[PDB]
Amino acid sequence: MYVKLISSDGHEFIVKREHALTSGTIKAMLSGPGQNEVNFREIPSHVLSKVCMYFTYKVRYTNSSTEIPEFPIAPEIALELLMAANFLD
Amino acid sequence: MSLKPRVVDFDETWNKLLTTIKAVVMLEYVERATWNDRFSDIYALCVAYPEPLGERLYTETKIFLENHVRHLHKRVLESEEQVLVMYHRYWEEYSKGADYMDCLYRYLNTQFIKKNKLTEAEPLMEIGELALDMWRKLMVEPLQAILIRMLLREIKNDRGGEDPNQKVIHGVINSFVHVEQYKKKFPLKFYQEIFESPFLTETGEYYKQEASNLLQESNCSQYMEKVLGRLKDEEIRCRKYLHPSSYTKVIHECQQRMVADHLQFLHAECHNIIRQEKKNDMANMYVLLRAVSTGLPHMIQELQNHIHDEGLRATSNLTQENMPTLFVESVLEVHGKFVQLINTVLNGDQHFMSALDKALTSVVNYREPKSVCKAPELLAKYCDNLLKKSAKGMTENEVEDRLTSFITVFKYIDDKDVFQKFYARMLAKRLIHGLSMSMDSEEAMINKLKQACGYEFTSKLHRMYTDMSVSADLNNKFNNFIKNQDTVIDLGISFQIYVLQAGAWPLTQAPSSTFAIPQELEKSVQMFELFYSQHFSGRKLTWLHYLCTGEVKMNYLGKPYVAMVTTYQMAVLLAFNNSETVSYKELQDSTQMNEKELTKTIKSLLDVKMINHDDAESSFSLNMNFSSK
Amino acid sequence: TAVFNAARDGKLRLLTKLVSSLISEKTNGATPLLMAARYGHLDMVEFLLEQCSASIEVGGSVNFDGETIEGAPPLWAASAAGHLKVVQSLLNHGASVNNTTLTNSTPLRAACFDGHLEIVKYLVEHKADLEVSNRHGHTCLMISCYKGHKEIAQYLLEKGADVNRKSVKGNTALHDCAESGSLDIMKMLLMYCAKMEKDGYGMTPLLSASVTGHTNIVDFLTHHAQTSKTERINALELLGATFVDKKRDLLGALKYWKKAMNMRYSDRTNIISKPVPQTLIMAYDYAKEVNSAEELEGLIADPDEMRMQALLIRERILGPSHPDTSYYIRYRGAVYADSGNFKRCINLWKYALDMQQSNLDPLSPMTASSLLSFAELFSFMLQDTVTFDDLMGILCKSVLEIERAIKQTQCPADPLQLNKALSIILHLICLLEKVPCTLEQDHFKKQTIYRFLKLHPRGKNNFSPLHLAVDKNTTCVGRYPVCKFPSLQVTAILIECGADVNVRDSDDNSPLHIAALNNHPDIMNLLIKSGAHFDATNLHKQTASDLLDEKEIAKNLIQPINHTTLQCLAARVIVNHRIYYKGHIPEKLETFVSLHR
Amino acid sequence: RFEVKKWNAVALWAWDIVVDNCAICRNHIMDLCIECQANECTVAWGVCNHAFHFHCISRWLKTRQVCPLDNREWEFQK
Amino acid sequence: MTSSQKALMLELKSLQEEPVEGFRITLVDESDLYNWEVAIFGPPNTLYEGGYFKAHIKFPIDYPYSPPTFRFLTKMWHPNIYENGDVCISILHPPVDDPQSGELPSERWNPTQNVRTILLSVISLLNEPNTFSPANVDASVMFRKWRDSKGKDKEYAEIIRKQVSATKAEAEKDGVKVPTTLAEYCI
Amino acid sequence: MDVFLMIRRHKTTIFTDAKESSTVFELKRIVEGILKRPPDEQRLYKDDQLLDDGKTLGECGFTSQTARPQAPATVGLAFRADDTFEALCIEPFSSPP
Amino acid sequence: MQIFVKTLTGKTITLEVEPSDTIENVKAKIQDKEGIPPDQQRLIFAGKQLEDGRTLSDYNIQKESTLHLVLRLRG
Amino acid sequence: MQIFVKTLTGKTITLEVEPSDTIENVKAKIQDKEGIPPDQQRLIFAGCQLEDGRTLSDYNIQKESTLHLVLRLLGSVNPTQGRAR
Ligand SMILES: [Zn+2]
Ligand SMILES: [Zn+2]
Ligand SMILES: [Zn+2]
């Protein structure tokens, strides 16, 4: 019930399927010629690490918490993270 | 490599993409290493640094789909007599392939396609919608007539048991409904026109021919089951060949043809059937004729006529000598029998209970050309015969059931007024002389009548009942006035009086004979009048001489006798008290009344001959020669 | 100079005593000299003049007849107040005698406005002009002759003034006299060589005197000749119509119409026909002028025929140019509406509005006032029948007026005037939505509102119609349950019709911002689930959530996580830390991050 | 000679004034009131020869006093 | 089922018989017994030879306690009527006193008034009005002028003749002879 | 309560949760379910604590104020092969411009 | 003579005063017959209200007419 | 020639009004006597109002009369008033 995501430098991230199905592009994959490794040749490690954390945060704090603390995001990865979040959803 | 925009050649990229889309549309094999690799190539194309190439991508995809569709149509039309067997084969692949390849172009659908025409209503479209439009182009400008003709020929195998390929015809027909992407307003127009028009026309023609064939060599009895079986097979045939939304129209057309083309043929046999029983044969005709717009009133009229004739035969002929019980019994029997028949075979239709009510109303209020409607008199006679019960012959509980049944017949008489007056008079005569079956039953009478007809109908009876209920209490609580009258009381006649109202009691005949009053009756009347006036004032108490009946206890003969007799003969005997012989002149002058009543009283006295005669001055005398029990 | 202008402040003991820095001590659009010369403070005026006379001609603001007037010289105010002593004190001190106000108002005009004859002769005996008019070119002679004032008129005439003084509208002094009777000035002006001239709408002074309702000057002009039969006939019919409309006398109307028709018939040689149109009017109950003396008698029994006859006579004689005809038509409609009958009022007002629009400039208070009458009528009639056709028609006329107004070449219409039209339209849409209909009429409503929305209108503070649909200040029109904007229904119709959900006002306030400022979380949810943007930024650094009150955040009717993506957070950080992004990211993403500023 | 032991008889009674109908509630005097008919109450009398209802005369007594035919007075006694 | 409906249905089924002059109970659907419709034949010797004046009567919720209202559809000229067919019958006023007339001498509503007596009162007022309290001053003034003139001025006669001619044409068209024979009028 | 953890060995990272403070045997069982490895052949290194594999996570230091989902915490891992264990080889992420 | 004047109650009671009496006599007779004061009652013959100061010979009612009385009112 | 007036205080005021008069003249007389505002004063005789502009002679007012002055979609329009003036 897990998916495997490979970055553009070698690191492999294993995240649960329901969490990973948030982005529309990942849902576009895993639905086609077959029905578990997804290879991205562009995303660096320091952005793909934060994408999974955002997935976890969004799934966990969906409609339950009364007060949601802010998402920490450094300004040294903002330009690349915007493009990465645009390619995905 | 990075997601930053860059200059893209569009020569190697499109050649790379052409191989994958071709292998995906045809449902071939594509590995997961290249399916994910082909992603982000569209992203790089969409974010080319100078002059992005989204429109070029759209144009080339459209051209590729056009070529593929044209090649498929060429192959399908090239093959002969195997059509509709390869159309399914090339549609099953194409639908799933378009659905899969729509997922590949998700970026181009989300951005650069979302800027389409808004909901203001061809220039731009999504990719799955474009593929479906291309297949529609294949289905409209090339072959439609051959496909429709072969589908109709395959469906035409109805009379024979030849089973066509169920998984092929259904798929072909359901392929027409797949215009769902452009189904903003009208999702079924294409299928509706193209298939629903000639299929309905052919079905109408074929079932007209089948109805003629069946009616040519059959009766009207072994015809309803045949058409019912045909209709029952039609629905199960239509389930596995057509869309869920096209059953009512087909069944309605089939019904319209077979039934509504020959409604005049069925009417003679509907007249024939109702006269006899034919319990099974009525249900088939009812089910058949519930579908046609106007076929039911003829059956309703026939049933009403049959019920009227049967009721008239049952009631009029069976008259006996003079009995009112067979009238109610026969009407109840007819009503119950036909209610049971209707409920058990016509599925409780309301349109026929009205016919039953009309026919029963007609049969219950029949009038002879030279006689009045003699229903209410017999109804009232049944009423008091069921209520007197001073003699044995019934019970104390079956009466209530008889009355509950009787209210049903009572609910049918047109002229209830004459019934009201008749029951008033006869209930009065029953109530005064105290021969009713104890009590707590006339209350059931009045309550049921009030519940059935209303209050103003029963207004003049409840107060009569209360008068009779309170007279006994008044007598019981008033008889002590004699004891508390201070002076001694010398009234030697036992007393029981009844105080009656004025308009409640319908015996208000104006008196015309001033009969004299007995001796002790004078003192009794004076005492009662004064005591009643003291008890309550503001009322004149009239005296009636034609219902007051006393009794005489005689012991002068060998056998003492008790005569329960009205006041006339007591007055006669008191006149005879003074002298043993009394003539007609002093009989006349001892009182003052019409001579007819005096003659009648004298004749009744002589009927058992308690007196003898030795007219104008005839001298009668006491007769000691008469004895009785 | 605190209390000097706050009160009259005579105070000869102290205020008289107190470089003269207060020589021209003026504030709040007012000066001490104006108040000194306003209330007849002779000692204060003398002290101010002796201290410094440099500010003798300084004018400020004053409110004499209720309304405030700006740029009023002290001499102009003193002439109006009647304080003679200050008047010749200033005249001897050397004040300018023709110092006009901001509206070219001479002190002579103010003097003759109230009727101060002695000030008039003293002013005009000191080299004062006579042919100086206001901005609208209304001379002092016309104002003097409007009122009675039949003592200064003769003296001013003897002073040698002109009498033919057409203004921009071409109204003579004879019109002003005829508007208020004054047969003595009639006789005087007629004696001194007066001419009988028309005006902008083509009104003879006799026709104006018949319109205003006076019954003596009309008789005078019935005499004195130089009038044909047609002029006297028209004057008499107009007098009868004015008796029926303005007042409520009917026997006099019978008498006037009887003498008019007797004169019309006259002799067999000279018979005048009745000019009538070839058309029949629906709202007039298809009536016609009774061209028969026999039909005149017995007409007193039915008043409604008289109302139709008077309306027809007024419409024929004057024409659609006047506002009086439309006003009287609407007045009769309102009278019938108050009489409990509602069927004919709608037709009468429909004809009146049709006449109004095809005669007069767009966005005028008359045609604007016409629409709220229909609004109140439909609000009352809904309140404890109504046809779709009438409401659709009136909405169509409103949209037509809006289109004609917005299609002006220069387009100088202020949003203040357009706000009333937009509010009337929205209230009409609500009242329409409160009524059942059919399919084709529903599609017609959708098409009409589509055209109206695509017209691209604007309002106060550069507000879209969608902005007004979700504001609590829109419902100022009427006071009945007109759904009391903001409302779910009107917003839903506007959104489904195709109203843009991301427009901006003058302060870059999206509709979500206005809704949040008016609470109502349901409208916020409806806008959000229609294409709107949750994280938008106005002119300041404020979002839609930061404008919310305590109740909305406490009840938790808006969940932010459901409508927030990672792009939003990245764009917010990029904007807040001022990172250079142009030339490094896609163009659409650049527009996105510009939006999320 | 002859004699007698017991005697039974009946008699009818009616008010000896007019035996008329109530002019207020428009029904016969010996009948129930309409409000009473919506479901035992007696019948009143006046000093005049007129005999009125009981509930009708009370309901109008809540507003005025005198005979509705004679604006003189009311007695209610007998 | 309420006392008002009971009283009105009793009065209707008593009114099924034949009154003298004003009696035409038209098609009341009996779904709402409060709304009625009556026609006036007209007296044989007064100014209304052979007329037919349709009317309308509205019965309040408390019929024996509250008075009803009377309206005329066709417009006539009567010094005691309003413009919209209303009438100023004193009997139709609620019982309360601000000076109008003597309360005691039957100048207001009492429960012993029925539709019959109401109708005869209406005919009596139509035959003989008062000039003390005009309902419309023009008809009051011409009433006084003709009464003093004893037939010199006939404007009132002319307008009444025109109106009765129109209503007689309508009556002769619809269904009824509109009797004026002084013999068929009496029942 | 619900703590959030990252388990990393070389170029690997697995995202998983925990209930409140459970036996590390349960975490090893979850790791085995992900990777099909024997629970007795693991070390489960903290920074330098070595996390004795019999206790609860509450005394291990993992609290609800340290393992928030917006910024998970890390726990090392080193399988001990047939010869011996590793030298706790964890690679770092790339350096962003 | 004999005239059966209709009363408010639905049962007319005849009067046979004399053919040429006065309305005062008629009102007094119906008063003693029913109890309605003369100052309160008002008589109608056929639509024309009859004044109380005249005599019955001025109306020519023959001998079988009908008068319907009503309560006094004014407009 | 003289009729009374029933004011809100109940005092009867005798006014010498001839038949050749009007409601405006009667209002002027009562304003001279007491000073009631015309916008508030009302005229009710025998339960119905007196129309303005209608002479009291045509209203059938006799000697020793009595009048009361109890205090007392729509016409929400005004005549045009746009000139220089
Ligand atoms: Zn009663
Ligand atoms: Zn009762
Ligand atoms: Zn009495």
Author numbering:
A (entry chain D): 17 to 51, 58 to 111
B (entry chain A): 1 to 121, 134 to 626, 633 to 647
C (entry chain H): 5 to 22, 31 to 396, 405 to 617
D (entry chain K): 21 to 59, 67 to 105
E (entry chain C): 6 to 192
F (entry chain G): 1 to 97
G (entry chain U): 1 to 75
H (entry chain E): 1 to 72, 692 to 704
Paper lines:
Cullin-RING ligase (CRL) E3s use Cdc34/UBE2R-family E2s to build Lys48-linked poly-ubiquitin chains to control an enormous swath of eukaryotic biology. Cdc34/UBE2R-family E2s are highly specialized in forging ubiquitin chains with Lys48-linkages that elicit 26S proteasome-dependent protein degradation. The CRL RING domain not only activates the E2-bound ubiquitin but also shapes the conformation of a distinctive UBE2R2 loop, positioning both the ubiquitin to be transferred and the substrate-linked acceptor ubiquitin within the active site. NEDD8 releases the RING domain from the CRL, but unlike previous CRL–E2 structures, does not contact UBE2R2.
As the transition state for poly-ubiquitylation is fleeting, a ligation mimic was used to join acceptor ubiquitin fused to a C-terminal degron peptide substrate (Sil1) with donor ubiquitin and eventual cross-linking to the UBE2R2 active site. The structure resolved to 3.8 Å resolution and enabled rationalization of poly-ubiquitylation on the millisecond time scale. For example, (1) the amino-terminal side of CUL2 binds the substrate receptor complex, while its C-terminal side interacts with the RBX1 subunit harboring the RING domain that recruits E2s45; (2) the UBE2R2 catalytic UBC domain and C-terminal extension both participate in forming the closed conformation for the UBE2R2~ubiquitin conjugate; and (3) the acceptor ubiquitin and the UBE2R2 UBC domain interact. Interestingly, NEDD8 is not visible in the cryo-EM map. Second, these differences occur concomitantly with the organization of the distinctive Cdc34/UBE2R-family E2 insertion (His98–Arg113), forming a loop that is the heart of the complex. The structure confirms the importance of His98, with its imidazole ring residing directly across from Cys93, the key active site residue that becomes thioesterified to donor ubiquitin. Rather, the loop residues unify the E2, E3 and the ubiquitins to be adjoined into a cohesive functional unit (inset). Multiple interactions between the UBE2R2 synergy loop and RBX1 facilitate shaping the loop’s conformation, which in turn forms interfaces with both the donor and acceptor ubiquitins. A unique E2–E3 interface is formed between the synergy loop and the RBX1 RING domain, stabilized by Glu108 in UBE2R2 and Arg91 in RBX1. In addition to contacts between UBE2R2 and the acceptor ubiquitin, CRL substrates are anchored by high-affinity interactions between their degrons and cognate receptors; here, the C terminus of the Sil1 peptide and FEM1C.
